[PDB]
RNA sequence: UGCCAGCCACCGCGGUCAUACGAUUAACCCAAAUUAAUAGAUCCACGGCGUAAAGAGUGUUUAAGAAAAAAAAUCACAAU
């Protein structure tokens, strides 16, 4: 008959889960800008998770999208398109030190 | 000689004989932070029956059980001091080292707070001397050593047929300890509280011994 | 001499039995003291197995309804202006005030969360506490 | 008489909830050259560095204001059975006890 | 016990043996209490509790240890590895 | 005597100080029997299968079994 005993509720303080920059966006092969954000400017390589920082789902999606856009003739493979050079940098890599 | 058997037999027939009940309470302990344990990731498996629960990852020791245990522990400790036997305070923690050495010096009791030499309890005659007496009780304010393994003296006092009282935190192993008192060994007010408590139990025991001795001498 | 097996049983078990067999001819002090007031559990050796499979521990997490409120308070206003004193036994924080106000407006029968929350915020503003909130 | 549950429910540590980003009052019980060992009253002391602004105002017994990050600094590491306790708390020293 | 000399090892082993002593409960001070079977490592000992007249039918080592304990009536079969220490 | 001559059920013995060969002294043990050889009696797994003998390269069904108490078939990604 003690009313000071704890209640078996789930954690109220529990934070929301953090989100990929793209959580509930739509990656489309047709838009070369968003894609070329995740590409190395000098090489044309695709950055990995440790760099882009995405849910597995969206890293996959970006990748497949990039490949498709590359062979369909939308986006260049061997460099980032100069036009998109000065777009926001979301990636964590620093070349010049 | 018969009345010496009287002076030894008398105190065992009362539950409270040194009246230690009044030295602390559940509130007293609670204000010393004693109920506080480590993270749940650090929990030792044998410590779970002593846990009231886990509040947001921190382990909360049940202080009802802590009081129930500490009662018996202090009871034993005083009874040992009364019957004139050696009490050793063992902790390897360097914060409270000085405090503990001080405490034991002031109870007229012995303290090993330093690096514990390997064969100390097991091989007594070589380390200490030709023939020796060994502590009839050992008190552990910290049941671990600074590498976070159980203090050897636990296993070796067990080995030696010596009873052991110790403060076993949320991550310590109670198994081989005779009178474990579940509680916080890390924070200063808790350590100080226990230092004081055992100090007082010792001192009271020795005094009652003196007085019942005086009464014994006036009996004839 | 004695029994140096730690794993066999309790110190009490071994000592009592060693006496019983006539090996140990002198009864120690701590034996009689033990006899009078035995510990809660027999201090027998036990091995700390790691837990496998589905098995988990029995430890209960500690939660009260007050928490269910404190979460909302902290979500809106964050930690209070009064900081915290963990030294003061009877210290009540800004959140605890909010909790009691909310509990009292709950006894008036308001089942809507918005009403209770905003009016406990007003009942606190009345006493002179400043809630700066957060964005 | 007060049941232990009763005390625990209402204690200042229970009232705080999650210890992340909490404004707390704490006391300096020890000092090494730049290191201020600060008991904020939870379990473990934290350890802060002596700021450049009013450096000598921080002494044994001084009271200060902290932002609590972690109650106990702990993590599990590769191939270990239990976590690894640093035996400290994590805090930010803000200023000293404006009064 | 272990030494370069046989004599030394004998001494060491005696004096060390006194320190590890077991109390073995004896039903009616001749047999054991109940049937035992144990697998210790790769060894299997199986001991059955006999009546009063049936003396010590056992592996010779076990008969020895039994005469030292004071167990006067037993049956024990050992299977698997007969390695002495185990 | 000296890796010779020889011996042994298994381990093994003999290279100049052989309790192991050959003989002597002593002893042990069976005994009107005693050894050797050969057949039996007895003796394998109700044990095992990562490294030791051993989970058969894969899946499905047949025969044959088990069902012994509580539920389920189903969604990013490089099957074919
Ligand atoms: Mg600890
Ligand atoms: Mg021959
Ligand atoms: Mg010769
Ligand atoms: Mg022969
Ligand atoms: Mg011959
Ligand atoms: Mg076989
Ligand atoms: Mg094989
Ligand atoms: Mg296979
Ligand atoms: Mg094959
Ligand atoms: Zn996402």
Q: Which of C60, C64, C102 to mutate to test the interface with A (most CBs of A within 10 A)?
A: C64
Using C1' positions and the CA of A57, the closest nucleotide is F76
Unique residue bearing structure tokens 């790691």: C50
The two most distant CA atoms of chain C are separated, in Å, by 81
E81 CA to centre of ligand 6 in angstroms: 12
Nearby residues of E69 by Cβ (< 8 Å), 6 or more positions away: E24, E26
- CA-CA-CA-CA torsion for B198, B202, B203, B204, nearest 10 degrees? 100
Q: Which two tokens stand for residue B47?
A: 């410590």
- Positive or negative, the CA dihedral C64, C67, C68, C69 is positive
CB contact under 8 A, B12 and C32: yes
Between strands B164-168 and B110-112, the pairing is unpaired
Half-sphere exposure of E61 toward its Cβ, with a 13 Å CA cutoff?
Answer: 8
With an 8 Å Cβ cutoff, is C48 touching chain B? yes
Let me know: does A61 contact A49? Beta carbons within 8 Å: no
- Expt. technique: cryo-EM
Based on its alpha-carbon atoms, the radius of gyration of chain B, rounded to whole angstroms, reads: 18
List chains adjacent to chain D, taking adjacency as at least 3 C-beta pairs closer than 8 Å.
A, B, C
Breaks in chain E after residues (C–N exceeding 2.5 Å)? none
Contact (Cβ atoms closer than 8 angstroms) between residue B202 and residue B107: yes
Report the neighbours of B using a cutoff of 3 or more CB pairs below 8 angstroms.
Answer: C, D
Cβ atoms within 10 Å, residue C101: 21
Closest CA to B86 of B59, B109, B113: B109
Interface A-C: count of C-beta contacts within 8 A: 25
Neighbours of B127 (CB within 10 A): 13
CA B172-B177-B183 angle, to 5 degrees, is: 45
**How many helices (DSSP H) and strands (DSSP E) are in chain B?**
7, 8
Strands, E, within chain E: which ranges?
A: 36-40, 43-48, 57-58, 75-80
From CA B31, how far away is CA B184, in angstroms rounded? 12
CA E80–ligand 7 middle distance (angstroms) = 21
Q: Tokens 């014994």 belong to which residue?
A: B216
User: Can you list the alpha helix ranges (DSSP code H) found in A5-89?
Assistant: 32-37, 49-52, 56-71
Place of tokens 């856009």: A69
Q: 């589905």: which residue's tokens?
A: C54
Helix residue ranges, H only, chain C: 11-20, 29-36, 65-77, 94-106, 113-125
Measured from the Cβ of residue C129, the count of other Cβ atoms closer than 10 Å reads: 14
Pairing between β-strand D22-31 and β-strand D35-39 as defined by DSSP bridges: antiparallel
Q: Which residues pair with A37 in a beta bridge?
A: none
Q: Which residues pair with D38 in a beta bridge?
A: D28, D46
3-class state of residue B11 by DSSP: helix
B2 Cβ neighbours under 8 A, 6+ residues apart: none
Instruction: Provide, in whole angstroms, the distance separating residue D22's CA from nucleotide F4's C1'.
Output: 101
Q: How far apart are CA E72 and CA B101, in angstroms?
A: 55
Q: What's the count of helices (H) and strands (E) in chain D, helices before strands? A: 2, 7
The beta-carbon neighbor of C33 closest among B76, B164, B180 is: B76
Distance CA B127, CA D92 (A): 49
The answer to whether the CB of A44 falls within 8 A of the CB of A78 is yes
- Domain locations in chain B? 1-220
Documented resolution in Å: 3.2
**Quick one: which H or E segment has residue D5?**
helix D4-10
Q: How far is CA B12 from CA B18, B68, B210, B219, D45, in A?
A: 11, 19, 17, 21, 43
Locus of tokens 């959140």: C95
Q: Which of B53, B136, B173 sits opposite C62 (nearest CB)?
A: B53
CB contact under 8 A, A7 and C74: no
Sequence-ordered list of residues with C-beta below 8 angstroms from that of A70, at least 6 positions apart, any chain: A76, A77
Query: Alpha carbon of C105 to those of B122, C98, C100, D21: distances in Å?
Result: 68, 11, 9, 29
Beta carbons within 10 angstroms of residue C39's beta carbon: 19
Distance from the alpha carbon of residue A91 to the mean position of ligand 10, in angstroms: 16
Q: What is the largest CA-CA distance in chain B?
A: 65
What are the distances in angstroms from CA D55 to CA B176, D26, E5? 49, 17, 72
- In whole angstroms, what is the distance from residue C8 CA to residue C5 CA? 6
Strand, helix or coil for residue B139 = strand
Query: How is residue D62 written in tokens?
Result: 């001084």
- D5, D17, D18 ranked by CB distance to A5: nearest: D5
A49 CB less than 7 Å from any atom of strand F: no
Interior angle at CA C74, CA C73 and CA C77, nearest 5: 75
Distance CA D33, CA B207 (A): 45
> Residues with Cβ < 8 Å from B89, sequence gap 6 or more?
B100, B103, B104, B109, B110, B111, B112, B113, B139, B141, B198
> Which alpha helices (H) appear in chain B, and where do they start and end?
2-9, 26-31, 63-82, 97-107, 124-127, 152-159, 188-218
Contact: D7, B60; criterion CB under 8 Å: no
Is residue B5 part of an annotated ligand binding site?
Answer: no
Rounded Cα gap, residues C30 and D99, in angstroms: 56
Q: What's the rounded Cα separation, in Å, for the pair C70 and C68?
A: 6
Burial class (CB in 10 A: 0-12, 13-18, 19+), C11: buried
H helix or E strand, kind and range, residue E9: helix E6-19
Neighbours of B139 (CB within 10 A): 28
Instruction: Determine the Cα–Cα distance for residues B167 and B50; give it in Å rounded to an integer.
Output: 12
Looking at residue B171, what DSSP letter applies?
A: T
CB contact under 8 A, C67 and A13: yes
């Amino acid at each position: 008959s003690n009313e000071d005993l704890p209640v078996p509720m789930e954690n109220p303080y529990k934070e929301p889960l953090k989100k990929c920059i793209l959580c509930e966006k739509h990656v489309d092969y047709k838009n070369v800008q968003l894609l070329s954000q995740f590409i190395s400017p000098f090489t044309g390589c695709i950055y990995g998770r440790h760099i882009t920082g995405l849910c597995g789902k969206k890293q996959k999606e970006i990748t497949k999208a990039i490949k498709r856009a590359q062979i369909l003739g939308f986006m260049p493979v061997t460099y980032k398109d100069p036009a998109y050079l000065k777009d926001p940098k979301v990636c964590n890599i620093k070349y010049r030190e | 000689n018969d009345l010496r058997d009287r002076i030894l037999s008398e105190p065992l027939k009362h539950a409270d004989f040194f009246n230690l009940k009044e030295l602390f309470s559940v509130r007293s302990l609670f204000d010393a932070r004693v109920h506080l344990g480590h993270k749940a990731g650090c929990r030792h498996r044998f410590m779970e029956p002593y846990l009231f629960g886990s509040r947001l990852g921190q382990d909360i020791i049940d202080l009802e059980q802590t009081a129930a245990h500490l009662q018996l522990a202090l009871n034993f400790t005083a009874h040992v001091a009364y019957r004139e036997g050696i009490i050793l305070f063992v902790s390897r923690h360097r914060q409270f080292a000085h405090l503990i050495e001080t405490t034991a010096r002031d109870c007229g009791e012995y303290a090993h707070t330093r690096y514990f030499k390997g064969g100390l309890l097991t091989n007594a005659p070589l380390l200490l001397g030709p023939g020796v007496r060994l502590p009839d009780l050992i008190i552990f304010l910290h049941t671990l050593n600074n590498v976070f393994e159980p203090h050897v003296a636990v296993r070796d006092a067990a080995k030696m047929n010596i009873p052991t009282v110790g403060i076993v935190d949320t991550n310590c192993n109670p198994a081989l300890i005779t009178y474990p008192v579940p509680g916080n060994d890390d924070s200063p007010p808790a350590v100080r509280l226990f230092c004081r408590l055992f100090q007082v139990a010792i001192s009271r025991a020795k005094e009652k011994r003196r007085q019942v001795e005086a009464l014994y001498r006036l009996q004839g | 001499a004695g029994s140096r097996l730690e794993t066999v049983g309790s110190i009490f078990s071994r000592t009592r039995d060693l006496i019983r067999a006539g090996v140990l001819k002198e009864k120690p002090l701590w034996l009689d003291i033990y006899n009078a007031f035995p510990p809660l559990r027999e201090p027998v050796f036990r091995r700390p197995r790691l837990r496998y499979g589905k098995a988990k521990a029995a430890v209960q997490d500690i939660f009260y309804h007050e928490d269910r409120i404190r979460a909302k308070f902290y979500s809106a206003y964050g930690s209070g202006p009064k900081a915290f004193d963990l030294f003061n036994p009877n210290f009540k924080s800004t959140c605890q005030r909010f909790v009691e106000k909310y509990i009292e407006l709950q006894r008036l029968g308001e089942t809507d969360e918005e009403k209770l929350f905003v009016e406990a915020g007003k009942a606190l503003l009345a006493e002179g506490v400043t809630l700066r909130r957060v964005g | 008489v007060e049941s232990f549950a009763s005390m625990l429910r209402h204690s200042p540590l229970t009232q705080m909830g999650p210890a992340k980003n909490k404004l707390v009052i704490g006391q300096i019980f020890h000092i090494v050259e730049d290191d201020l060992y600060i008991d904020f009253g939870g379990k473990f002391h934290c350890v802060c560095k002596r700021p450049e602004v009013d450096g000598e105002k921080y002494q044994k017994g001084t009271r200060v204001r902290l932002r609590l990050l972690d109650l106990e600094l702990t993590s599990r590491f590769l191939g270990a059975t239990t976590d690894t306790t640093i035996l400290e708390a994590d805090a930010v020293l803000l200023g000293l006890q404006e009064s | 016990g272990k030494a370069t000399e046989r004599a030394d090892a004998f001494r060491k082993a005696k004096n060390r043996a006194v320190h590890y002593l077991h109390y073995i409960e004896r039903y009616e001070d001749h047999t054991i209490y109940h049937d035992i079977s144990l697998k210790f490592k790769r060894t299997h000992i199986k001991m059955k509790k006999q009546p009063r007249g049936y003396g010590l039918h056992c592996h010779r080592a076990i008969m020895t240890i039994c005469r030292l304990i004071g167990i006067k009536d037993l049956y024990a079969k050992v299977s698997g590895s007969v390695n002495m220490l185990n």
